[PDB]
Amino acid sequence: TRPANHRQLTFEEIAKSAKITVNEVELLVMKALSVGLVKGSIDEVDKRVHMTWVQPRVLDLQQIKGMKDRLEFWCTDVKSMEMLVEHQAHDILT
Amino acid sequence: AVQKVVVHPLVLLSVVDHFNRIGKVGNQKRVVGVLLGSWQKKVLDVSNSFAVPFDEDDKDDSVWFLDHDYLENMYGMFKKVNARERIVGWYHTGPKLHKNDIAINELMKRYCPNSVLVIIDVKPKDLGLPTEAYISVEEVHDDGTPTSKTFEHVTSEIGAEEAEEVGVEHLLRDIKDTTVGTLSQRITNQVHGLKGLNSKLLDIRSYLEKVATGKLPINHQIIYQLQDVFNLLPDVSLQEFVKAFYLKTNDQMVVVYLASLIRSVVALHNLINNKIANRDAEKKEG
Protein backbone atom coordinates (compact mmCIF):
# COMPACT_ATOMS: atom_id res chain seq x y z
CA THR A 1 0.00 0.00 0.00
CA ARG A 2 2.79 2.43 0.88
CA PRO A 3 4.33 4.09 -2.19
CA ALA A 4 7.99 4.20 -3.22
CA ASN A 5 8.14 7.67 -1.63
CA HIS A 6 8.65 6.22 1.84
CA ARG A 7 7.59 2.54 2.25
CA GLN A 8 8.96 2.93 5.78
CA LEU A 9 6.80 2.19 8.80
CA THR A 10 6.92 1.98 12.58
CA PHE A 11 6.29 -0.64 15.24
CA GLU A 12 3.50 1.51 16.67
CA GLU A 13 1.72 1.24 13.33
CA ILE A 14 2.40 -2.50 13.21
CA ALA A 15 1.16 -2.80 16.80
CA LYS A 16 -2.02 -1.02 15.72
CA SER A 17 -2.70 -2.91 12.50
CA ALA A 18 -1.94 -6.34 13.97
CA LYS A 19 -2.92 -5.18 17.53
CA ILE A 20 0.00 -7.18 18.95
CA THR A 21 2.41 -5.83 21.54
CA VAL A 22 5.74 -4.08 21.09
CA ASN A 23 7.93 -7.04 22.03
CA GLU A 24 6.65 -9.47 19.38
CA VAL A 25 6.72 -7.57 16.07
CA GLU A 26 10.49 -7.91 15.78
CA LEU A 27 10.12 -11.67 16.08
CA LEU A 28 7.44 -11.40 13.42
CA VAL A 29 9.54 -9.44 10.94
CA MET A 30 12.64 -11.58 11.43
CA LYS A 31 10.41 -14.50 10.50
CA ALA A 32 9.20 -12.51 7.49
CA LEU A 33 12.79 -11.93 6.39
CA SER A 34 13.55 -15.61 7.00
CA VAL A 35 10.69 -16.64 4.73
CA GLY A 36 11.85 -13.97 2.32
CA LEU A 37 8.42 -12.63 1.44
CA VAL A 38 9.87 -9.23 2.33
CA LYS A 39 13.37 -7.77 2.11
CA GLY A 40 14.35 -4.80 4.22
CA SER A 41 16.34 -3.59 7.20
CA ILE A 42 15.57 -3.09 10.88
CA ASP A 43 16.40 -0.05 12.93
CA GLU A 44 15.54 -0.46 16.59
CA VAL A 45 16.25 2.91 18.20
CA ASP A 46 13.95 4.95 15.94
CA LYS A 47 11.51 1.99 15.89
CA ARG A 48 11.31 2.06 12.09
CA VAL A 49 12.08 -0.48 9.38
CA HIS A 50 13.17 0.23 5.80
CA MET A 51 11.20 -2.25 3.72
CA THR A 52 12.66 -2.49 0.23
CA TRP A 53 11.47 -5.63 -1.58
CA VAL A 54 8.11 -7.31 -1.07
CA GLN A 55 6.56 -10.51 -2.38
CA PRO A 56 4.89 -9.77 -5.74
CA ARG A 57 1.12 -10.26 -5.56
CA VAL A 58 -1.68 -10.32 -8.10
CA LEU A 59 -4.05 -7.52 -9.08
CA ASP A 60 -7.15 -6.75 -11.12
CA LEU A 61 -7.82 -4.76 -14.32
CA GLN A 62 -7.70 -1.51 -12.31
CA GLN A 63 -4.04 -1.43 -11.33
CA ILE A 64 -3.03 -1.98 -14.96
CA LYS A 65 -4.46 1.47 -15.65
CA GLY A 66 -2.05 2.83 -13.05
CA MET A 67 0.88 0.90 -14.50
CA LYS A 68 -0.28 2.10 -17.92
CA ASP A 69 -0.12 5.72 -16.83
CA ARG A 70 3.20 5.27 -15.02
CA LEU A 71 4.48 3.71 -18.24
CA GLU A 72 3.08 6.60 -20.25
CA PHE A 73 5.03 9.56 -18.92
CA TRP A 74 8.03 7.27 -18.54
CA CYS A 75 7.96 7.08 -22.34
CA THR A 76 8.13 10.83 -22.84
CA ASP A 77 11.09 11.20 -20.50
CA VAL A 78 13.00 8.92 -22.87
CA LYS A 79 11.67 10.97 -25.79
CA SER A 80 12.55 14.31 -24.20
CA MET A 81 15.99 13.35 -22.91
CA GLU A 82 16.83 11.50 -26.11
CA MET A 83 15.89 14.53 -28.21
CA LEU A 84 18.64 16.58 -26.53
CA VAL A 85 21.16 13.95 -27.59
CA GLU A 86 19.83 13.94 -31.16
CA HIS A 87 19.59 17.71 -31.57
CA GLN A 88 22.68 18.76 -29.66
CA ALA A 89 24.84 15.79 -30.72
CA HIS A 90 23.96 16.31 -34.40
CA ASP A 91 27.30 17.60 -35.66
CA ILE A 92 29.17 14.63 -34.19
CA LEU A 93 27.37 12.20 -36.48
CA THR A 94 25.44 12.88 -39.65
CA ALA B 1 21.95 -24.84 -20.33
CA VAL B 2 23.47 -23.18 -23.41
CA GLN B 3 24.85 -19.71 -22.72
CA LYS B 4 24.70 -17.88 -26.07
CA VAL B 5 25.18 -18.40 -29.79
CA VAL B 6 27.68 -17.45 -32.49
CA VAL B 7 26.38 -16.76 -36.00
CA HIS B 8 28.50 -16.23 -39.10
CA PRO B 9 27.89 -13.99 -42.12
CA LEU B 10 28.19 -17.07 -44.33
CA VAL B 11 25.08 -18.67 -42.89
CA LEU B 12 23.54 -15.18 -42.62
CA LEU B 13 23.71 -14.64 -46.37
CA SER B 14 23.26 -18.38 -46.88
CA VAL B 15 19.63 -18.18 -45.86
CA VAL B 16 18.93 -15.11 -47.98
CA ASP B 17 20.28 -16.53 -51.23
CA HIS B 18 17.97 -19.49 -50.73
CA PHE B 19 15.10 -17.06 -50.17
CA ASN B 20 16.04 -15.62 -53.54
CA ARG B 21 16.26 -19.03 -55.20
CA ILE B 22 12.75 -19.89 -54.04
CA GLY B 23 11.77 -16.23 -54.52
CA LYS B 24 10.20 -17.12 -57.88
CA VAL B 25 7.33 -18.88 -56.07
CA GLY B 26 5.60 -15.48 -55.83
CA ASN B 27 2.62 -16.40 -53.66
CA GLN B 28 3.89 -17.76 -50.34
CA LYS B 29 6.79 -19.80 -49.00
CA ARG B 30 8.86 -19.81 -45.84
CA VAL B 31 12.51 -20.81 -46.02
CA VAL B 32 13.22 -23.71 -43.66
CA GLY B 33 16.60 -25.36 -43.46
CA VAL B 34 19.08 -27.37 -41.46
CA LEU B 35 21.60 -25.49 -39.32
CA LEU B 36 25.11 -26.94 -38.99
CA GLY B 37 27.99 -26.22 -36.66
CA SER B 38 29.57 -27.11 -33.34
CA TRP B 39 29.30 -25.88 -29.79
CA GLN B 40 32.15 -25.72 -27.31
CA LYS B 41 32.54 -24.44 -23.74
CA LYS B 42 28.73 -24.06 -23.56
CA VAL B 43 29.02 -21.46 -26.32
CA LEU B 44 26.90 -22.28 -29.34
CA ASP B 45 28.47 -21.89 -32.77
CA VAL B 46 26.97 -21.83 -36.26
CA SER B 47 29.18 -22.36 -39.31
CA ASN B 48 27.26 -23.81 -42.25
CA SER B 49 23.71 -24.52 -43.40
CA PHE B 50 21.52 -25.54 -46.30
CA ALA B 51 17.79 -25.78 -46.90
CA VAL B 52 15.43 -28.76 -47.08
CA PRO B 53 12.78 -29.12 -49.82
CA PHE B 54 9.63 -27.90 -48.14
CA ASP B 55 6.05 -26.90 -48.91
CA GLU B 56 2.95 -26.07 -46.87
CA ASP B 57 -0.74 -25.37 -47.46
CA ASP B 58 -2.89 -22.96 -45.44
CA LYS B 59 -5.92 -25.25 -45.48
CA ASP B 60 -5.11 -27.97 -42.90
CA ASP B 61 -1.89 -26.26 -41.87
CA SER B 62 -0.59 -29.13 -39.72
CA VAL B 63 1.21 -30.95 -42.54
CA TRP B 64 4.91 -30.59 -43.32
CA PHE B 65 7.63 -32.55 -45.07
CA LEU B 66 11.38 -32.78 -44.63
CA ASP B 67 13.10 -35.05 -47.13
CA HIS B 68 15.25 -37.18 -44.85
CA ASP B 69 16.96 -38.76 -47.86
CA TYR B 70 18.18 -35.28 -48.84
CA LEU B 71 19.00 -34.71 -45.17
CA GLU B 72 21.04 -37.89 -44.66
CA ASN B 73 22.81 -37.73 -48.00
CA MET B 74 23.72 -34.05 -47.91
CA TYR B 75 24.83 -34.14 -44.27
CA GLY B 76 26.80 -37.27 -45.11
CA MET B 77 28.47 -35.22 -47.85
CA PHE B 78 29.16 -32.36 -45.44
CA LYS B 79 30.56 -34.78 -42.88
CA LYS B 80 32.77 -36.25 -45.62
CA VAL B 81 34.13 -32.90 -46.79
CA ASN B 82 34.38 -31.74 -43.16
CA ALA B 83 34.36 -34.27 -40.33
CA ARG B 84 34.86 -31.40 -37.87
CA GLU B 85 31.55 -29.92 -39.02
CA ARG B 86 28.37 -31.53 -37.67
CA ILE B 87 24.70 -30.86 -36.96
CA VAL B 88 23.72 -28.09 -34.57
CA GLY B 89 19.99 -27.46 -35.06
CA TRP B 90 17.77 -25.80 -37.67
CA TYR B 91 16.27 -22.52 -38.79
CA HIS B 92 13.18 -21.19 -40.45
CA THR B 93 12.91 -17.85 -42.22
CA GLY B 94 10.81 -16.51 -39.33
CA PRO B 95 8.72 -13.48 -40.04
CA LYS B 96 6.33 -14.10 -37.14
CA LEU B 97 6.90 -17.63 -35.69
CA HIS B 98 4.84 -20.02 -37.83
CA LYS B 99 2.70 -22.70 -36.17
CA ASN B 100 4.52 -25.86 -37.34
CA ASP B 101 7.58 -24.49 -35.49
CA ILE B 102 6.51 -26.32 -32.34
CA ALA B 103 6.99 -29.86 -33.67
CA ILE B 104 9.50 -29.33 -36.45
CA ASN B 105 11.90 -29.42 -33.49
CA GLU B 106 10.17 -32.57 -32.32
CA LEU B 107 10.49 -34.01 -35.83
CA MET B 108 14.27 -33.56 -35.85
CA LYS B 109 15.15 -33.76 -32.15
CA ARG B 110 16.48 -37.30 -32.71
CA TYR B 111 19.40 -35.68 -34.58
CA CYS B 112 20.52 -33.06 -32.04
CA PRO B 113 19.79 -33.15 -28.29
CA ASN B 114 19.52 -29.39 -27.99
CA SER B 115 18.01 -29.04 -31.44
CA VAL B 116 18.04 -25.26 -31.60
CA LEU B 117 16.22 -23.00 -34.05
CA VAL B 118 17.14 -19.67 -35.63
CA ILE B 119 14.67 -17.00 -36.73
CA ILE B 120 16.03 -14.54 -39.29
CA ASP B 121 14.76 -11.64 -41.40
CA VAL B 122 14.41 -11.43 -45.18
CA LYS B 123 13.11 -7.83 -45.12
CA PRO B 124 15.79 -6.29 -42.91
CA LYS B 125 14.62 -3.18 -41.10
CA ASP B 126 14.83 -2.59 -37.34
CA LEU B 127 16.83 -0.74 -34.73
CA GLY B 128 18.29 -3.95 -33.30
CA LEU B 129 19.55 -7.35 -34.42
CA PRO B 130 17.22 -9.34 -36.72
CA THR B 131 18.58 -12.70 -35.57
CA GLU B 132 16.63 -14.75 -33.07
CA ALA B 133 17.18 -18.13 -31.43
CA TYR B 134 14.96 -19.99 -28.98
CA ILE B 135 15.54 -23.19 -27.02
CA SER B 136 13.12 -26.03 -26.30
CA VAL B 137 11.90 -26.56 -22.79
CA GLU B 138 8.78 -28.36 -21.66
CA GLU B 139 8.88 -26.58 -18.28
CA VAL B 140 6.34 -27.23 -15.53
CA HIS B 141 4.80 -24.42 -13.50
CA ASP B 142 2.24 -25.04 -10.77
CA ASP B 143 -1.11 -24.42 -12.44
CA GLY B 144 -2.91 -26.30 -15.21
CA THR B 145 -1.17 -28.64 -17.63
CA PRO B 146 2.45 -28.84 -16.37
CA THR B 147 4.80 -30.09 -19.08
CA SER B 148 4.38 -27.41 -21.74
CA LYS B 149 6.78 -27.33 -24.69
CA THR B 150 7.54 -23.59 -24.72
CA PHE B 151 10.45 -22.22 -26.70
CA GLU B 152 12.70 -19.88 -24.73
CA HIS B 153 14.90 -17.24 -26.34
CA VAL B 154 18.54 -17.57 -25.45
CA THR B 155 20.48 -14.38 -26.22
CA SER B 156 22.07 -14.05 -29.64
CA GLU B 157 24.87 -12.27 -31.48
CA ILE B 158 26.73 -12.37 -34.78
CA GLY B 159 30.11 -14.00 -34.43
CA ALA B 160 33.17 -13.12 -36.46
CA GLU B 161 36.11 -15.16 -37.69
CA GLU B 162 39.58 -14.07 -38.81
CA ALA B 163 39.11 -15.76 -42.18
CA GLU B 164 35.72 -14.27 -42.98
CA GLU B 165 36.53 -10.71 -41.87
CA VAL B 166 38.63 -10.27 -45.00
CA GLY B 167 35.59 -11.04 -47.13
CA VAL B 168 33.20 -9.05 -44.96
CA GLU B 169 35.37 -5.93 -44.82
CA HIS B 170 36.03 -6.36 -48.53
CA LEU B 171 32.35 -6.54 -49.31
CA LEU B 172 31.57 -3.43 -47.29
CA ARG B 173 33.77 -0.65 -48.83
CA ASP B 174 30.80 1.61 -48.04
CA ILE B 175 30.96 3.25 -44.62
CA LYS B 176 33.00 2.48 -41.54
CA ASP B 177 32.71 4.50 -38.32
CA THR B 178 36.19 3.65 -37.09
CA THR B 179 38.56 6.07 -35.43
CA VAL B 180 36.70 5.10 -32.28
CA GLY B 181 37.37 8.18 -30.21
CA THR B 182 35.01 10.17 -28.03
CA LEU B 183 32.35 9.81 -30.74
CA SER B 184 31.84 6.13 -31.47
CA GLN B 185 30.37 5.23 -28.08
CA ARG B 186 27.97 8.18 -28.35
CA ILE B 187 26.39 6.66 -31.42
CA THR B 188 26.93 2.93 -30.96
CA ASN B 189 25.13 3.05 -27.63
CA GLN B 190 24.24 6.53 -26.39
CA VAL B 191 22.20 7.71 -29.36
CA HIS B 192 21.21 4.24 -30.53
CA GLY B 193 20.91 2.61 -27.12
CA LEU B 194 18.15 4.95 -25.98
CA LYS B 195 16.23 3.83 -29.04
CA GLY B 196 17.12 0.35 -27.84
CA LEU B 197 15.22 1.27 -24.70
CA ASN B 198 12.42 2.73 -26.84
CA SER B 199 11.35 -0.54 -28.43
CA LYS B 200 11.45 -2.59 -25.23
CA LEU B 201 9.58 0.30 -23.63
CA LEU B 202 6.93 0.17 -26.35
CA ASP B 203 6.69 -3.63 -26.29
CA ILE B 204 5.11 -3.89 -22.84
CA ARG B 205 2.85 -1.01 -23.87
CA SER B 206 1.72 -3.17 -26.78
CA TYR B 207 1.19 -6.17 -24.49
CA LEU B 208 -0.66 -3.85 -22.12
CA GLU B 209 -3.42 -3.31 -24.75
CA LYS B 210 -5.61 -6.15 -23.33
CA VAL B 211 -7.08 -3.78 -20.70
CA ALA B 212 -10.61 -4.86 -21.44
CA THR B 213 -10.21 -5.54 -25.16
CA GLY B 214 -7.39 -7.90 -26.06
CA LYS B 215 -6.72 -11.57 -25.51
CA LEU B 216 -7.98 -13.89 -22.78
CA PRO B 217 -4.98 -14.67 -20.46
CA ILE B 218 -5.01 -11.90 -17.93
CA ASN B 219 -1.71 -11.83 -16.04
CA HIS B 220 -0.54 -14.62 -13.74
CA GLN B 221 2.96 -14.93 -15.17
CA ILE B 222 3.51 -11.46 -16.51
CA ILE B 223 3.02 -9.04 -13.63
CA TYR B 224 5.50 -10.38 -11.11
CA GLN B 225 8.25 -9.13 -13.41
CA LEU B 226 6.48 -5.79 -13.97
CA GLN B 227 5.83 -5.32 -10.26
CA ASP B 228 9.48 -6.29 -9.81
CA VAL B 229 10.47 -3.52 -12.24
CA PHE B 230 8.47 -0.84 -10.46
CA ASN B 231 9.85 -2.05 -7.15
CA LEU B 232 13.31 -2.08 -8.71
CA LEU B 233 13.06 1.52 -9.94
CA PRO B 234 16.08 3.43 -8.59
CA ASP B 235 16.66 5.92 -5.80
CA VAL B 236 15.51 9.54 -5.86
CA SER B 237 17.63 12.66 -5.26
CA LEU B 238 17.79 12.94 -1.49
CA GLN B 239 20.89 11.21 -0.25
CA GLU B 240 24.65 11.37 -0.47
CA PHE B 241 24.20 9.60 -3.83
CA VAL B 242 23.83 13.21 -4.80
CA LYS B 243 26.93 14.25 -2.89
CA ALA B 244 28.80 11.12 -3.92
CA PHE B 245 27.74 11.88 -7.48
CA TYR B 246 28.65 15.49 -7.31
CA LEU B 247 31.50 14.18 -5.20
CA LYS B 248 32.23 11.46 -7.76
CA THR B 249 32.18 13.59 -10.95
CA ASN B 250 34.14 16.38 -9.26
CA ASP B 251 37.04 13.90 -9.17
CA GLN B 252 36.75 12.99 -12.85
CA MET B 253 36.83 16.54 -14.17
CA VAL B 254 40.18 17.03 -12.40
CA VAL B 255 41.70 14.42 -14.71
CA VAL B 256 39.94 16.07 -17.64
CA TYR B 257 41.49 19.39 -16.59
CA LEU B 258 44.98 17.91 -16.45
CA ALA B 259 44.70 16.16 -19.83
CA SER B 260 43.34 19.19 -21.67
CA LEU B 261 45.98 21.26 -19.86
CA ILE B 262 48.82 19.19 -21.30
CA ARG B 263 47.30 18.96 -24.81
CA SER B 264 47.58 22.71 -25.39
CA VAL B 265 51.25 22.67 -24.37
CA VAL B 266 51.83 19.86 -26.87
CA ALA B 267 50.26 21.80 -29.75
CA LEU B 268 52.15 24.94 -28.72
CA HIS B 269 55.39 22.97 -28.89
CA ASN B 270 54.40 21.95 -32.40
CA LEU B 271 53.87 25.63 -33.23
CA ILE B 272 57.43 26.35 -32.11
CA ASN B 273 58.49 23.40 -34.26
CA ASN B 274 56.70 25.13 -37.12
CA LYS B 275 58.15 28.58 -36.55
CA ILE B 276 61.67 27.15 -36.55
CA ALA B 277 60.71 25.41 -39.80
CA ASN B 278 59.42 28.39 -41.77
CA ARG B 279 61.81 31.08 -40.51
CA ASP B 280 65.04 29.19 -41.08
CA ALA B 281 63.42 28.45 -44.44
CA GLU B 282 62.62 31.96 -45.66
CA LYS B 283 66.11 33.47 -45.46
CA LYS B 284 67.82 30.22 -46.49
CA GLU B 285 65.53 29.43 -49.42
CA GLY B 286 64.51 32.91 -50.55
Added chain:
Amino acid sequence: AKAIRDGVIEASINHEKGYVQSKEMIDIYSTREPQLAFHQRISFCLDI
Protein backbone atom coordinates in the same frame (compact mmCIF):
# COMPACT_ATOMS: atom_id res chain seq x y z
CA ALA C 1 22.19 42.54 8.79
CA LYS C 2 22.89 43.71 5.22
CA ALA C 3 25.89 41.36 5.21
CA ILE C 4 23.41 38.52 5.51
CA ARG C 5 20.95 40.25 3.17
CA ASP C 6 23.43 40.43 0.30
CA GLY C 7 25.24 37.14 0.82
CA VAL C 8 28.54 37.67 2.62
CA ILE C 9 27.49 35.56 5.60
CA GLU C 10 24.63 33.18 6.38
CA ALA C 11 23.60 32.67 9.95
CA SER C 12 21.49 34.45 12.50
CA ILE C 13 21.76 37.01 15.29
CA ASN C 14 20.18 36.66 18.71
CA HIS C 15 19.28 40.36 18.81
CA GLU C 16 17.68 39.88 22.22
CA LYS C 17 20.90 38.50 23.69
CA GLY C 18 23.48 40.11 21.43
CA TYR C 19 25.57 37.18 20.23
CA VAL C 20 25.95 36.49 16.52
CA GLN C 21 26.26 32.81 15.70
CA SER C 22 27.63 31.43 12.45
CA LYS C 23 27.22 27.90 11.17
CA GLU C 24 30.15 25.73 10.10
CA MET C 25 29.64 25.39 6.35
CA ILE C 26 32.11 22.74 5.22
CA ASP C 27 32.19 20.25 2.32
CA ILE C 28 32.21 22.71 -0.55
CA TYR C 29 33.60 19.83 -2.61
CA SER C 30 30.32 17.98 -3.06
CA THR C 31 28.56 21.30 -3.22
CA ARG C 32 28.52 21.33 -7.02
CA GLU C 33 30.71 24.40 -7.60
CA PRO C 34 34.34 23.53 -8.32
CA GLN C 35 32.85 21.75 -11.29
CA LEU C 36 31.93 25.24 -12.46
CA ALA C 37 35.43 26.41 -11.60
CA PHE C 38 36.59 23.60 -13.88
CA HIS C 39 34.10 24.22 -16.69
CA GLN C 40 35.16 27.85 -16.98
CA ARG C 41 38.69 26.59 -17.66
CA ILE C 42 38.13 23.39 -19.67
CA SER C 43 36.54 25.31 -22.53
CA PHE C 44 39.26 27.95 -22.29
CA CYS C 45 42.07 25.42 -22.58
CA LEU C 46 40.29 23.78 -25.51
CA ASP C 47 40.15 27.24 -27.06
CA ILE C 48 43.87 27.84 -26.62
Added chain:
Amino acid sequence: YLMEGSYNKVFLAKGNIPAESYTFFIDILLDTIRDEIAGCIEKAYEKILFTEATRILFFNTPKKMTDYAKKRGWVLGPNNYYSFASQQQKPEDTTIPSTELAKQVIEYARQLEMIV
Protein backbone atom coordinates in the same frame (compact mmCIF):
# COMPACT_ATOMS: atom_id res chain seq x y z
CA TYR D 1 25.96 55.68 4.16
CA LEU D 2 23.10 54.07 2.21
CA MET D 3 25.69 51.74 0.66
CA GLU D 4 26.54 50.00 3.93
CA GLY D 5 24.09 49.25 6.73
CA SER D 6 24.29 52.79 8.09
CA TYR D 7 20.61 53.36 8.85
CA ASN D 8 20.41 55.43 12.03
CA LYS D 9 22.96 57.93 10.72
CA VAL D 10 20.87 58.21 7.55
CA PHE D 11 17.81 59.02 9.63
CA LEU D 12 19.97 61.56 11.47
CA ALA D 13 20.88 63.14 8.15
CA LYS D 14 17.14 62.99 7.58
CA GLY D 15 16.49 66.28 9.31
CA ASN D 16 20.16 67.11 9.63
CA ILE D 17 19.86 68.73 6.21
CA PRO D 18 21.89 71.95 6.17
CA ALA D 19 21.04 73.12 2.65
CA GLU D 20 17.26 73.63 2.21
CA SER D 21 13.94 71.76 2.51
CA TYR D 22 14.69 68.68 0.28
CA THR D 23 11.41 67.32 1.63
CA PHE D 24 10.09 65.61 -1.52
CA PHE D 25 13.42 63.83 -1.82
CA ILE D 26 13.74 62.68 1.78
CA ASP D 27 10.16 61.37 1.63
CA ILE D 28 11.05 59.15 -1.30
CA LEU D 29 14.05 58.38 0.88
CA LEU D 30 11.67 57.91 3.81
CA ASP D 31 9.92 55.19 1.83
CA THR D 32 12.60 53.39 -0.19
CA ILE D 33 14.02 52.59 3.25
CA ARG D 34 10.58 51.71 4.68
CA ASP D 35 10.46 48.73 2.37
CA GLU D 36 14.11 48.09 3.26
CA ILE D 37 13.44 47.70 6.99
CA ALA D 38 10.21 45.96 5.94
CA GLY D 39 12.53 43.45 4.35
CA CYS D 40 15.04 43.57 7.20
CA ILE D 41 12.55 42.05 9.63
CA GLU D 42 12.45 39.06 7.25
CA LYS D 43 15.87 37.70 8.22
CA ALA D 44 16.48 34.81 10.64
CA TYR D 45 15.66 36.49 13.93
CA GLU D 46 14.18 35.38 17.25
CA LYS D 47 10.79 36.31 18.70
CA ILE D 48 10.91 40.11 18.64
CA LEU D 49 8.55 41.68 21.18
CA PHE D 50 6.20 44.58 20.45
CA THR D 51 8.81 47.16 21.35
CA GLU D 52 12.10 46.51 19.51
CA ALA D 53 11.01 46.30 15.88
CA THR D 54 8.20 48.62 16.91
CA ARG D 55 10.81 51.32 17.58
CA ILE D 56 13.42 50.53 14.93
CA LEU D 57 11.76 52.85 12.45
CA PHE D 58 10.15 56.01 13.89
CA PHE D 59 6.82 54.94 15.38
CA ASN D 60 5.47 54.60 18.93
CA THR D 61 2.30 52.43 18.41
CA PRO D 62 0.21 53.28 15.34
CA LYS D 63 -1.33 50.58 13.16
CA LYS D 64 1.65 50.94 10.83
CA MET D 65 2.96 47.85 12.61
CA THR D 66 -0.34 46.32 11.51
CA ASP D 67 0.33 47.58 7.98
CA TYR D 68 3.67 45.77 7.93
CA ALA D 69 2.65 42.91 10.25
CA LYS D 70 -0.28 42.16 7.95
CA LYS D 71 1.68 43.10 4.83
CA ARG D 72 4.43 40.57 5.54
CA GLY D 73 4.70 37.92 8.22
CA TRP D 74 6.26 38.27 11.67
CA VAL D 75 2.61 38.27 12.59
CA LEU D 76 0.91 39.99 15.55
CA GLY D 77 1.03 37.49 18.43
CA PRO D 78 1.51 37.19 22.20
CA ASN D 79 4.12 39.99 22.24
CA ASN D 80 5.32 37.95 19.34
CA TYR D 81 6.75 38.28 15.84
CA TYR D 82 6.74 34.91 14.08
CA SER D 83 9.86 33.48 12.40
CA PHE D 84 9.08 31.38 9.33
CA ALA D 85 12.79 30.84 8.63
CA SER D 86 12.26 27.76 6.47
CA GLN D 87 14.85 27.94 3.59
CA GLN D 88 14.34 24.22 2.96
CA GLN D 89 13.06 23.26 -0.47
CA LYS D 90 15.59 24.46 -3.05
CA PRO D 91 18.63 22.03 -2.71
CA GLU D 92 19.10 18.43 -3.93
CA ASP D 93 18.90 18.98 -7.67
CA THR D 94 20.79 16.47 -9.80
CA THR D 95 18.43 16.48 -12.78
CA ILE D 96 19.01 20.14 -13.70
CA PRO D 97 22.76 19.34 -13.65
CA SER D 98 21.82 16.13 -15.44
CA THR D 99 20.50 18.32 -18.27
CA GLU D 100 22.94 21.22 -18.18
CA LEU D 101 25.93 18.93 -17.84
CA ALA D 102 24.42 16.81 -20.56
CA LYS D 103 24.72 19.96 -22.64
CA GLN D 104 28.24 20.83 -21.46
CA VAL D 105 29.81 17.40 -21.96
CA ILE D 106 28.54 17.29 -25.53
CA GLU D 107 29.98 20.79 -25.91
CA TYR D 108 33.29 19.32 -24.79
CA ALA D 109 32.98 16.54 -27.36
CA ARG D 110 32.26 19.01 -30.16
CA GLN D 111 35.51 20.93 -29.78
CA LEU D 112 37.55 17.83 -29.13
CA GLU D 113 37.25 15.60 -32.19
CA MET D 114 35.23 17.62 -34.68
CA ILE D 115 37.70 19.71 -36.65
CA VAL D 116 37.04 23.43 -36.54
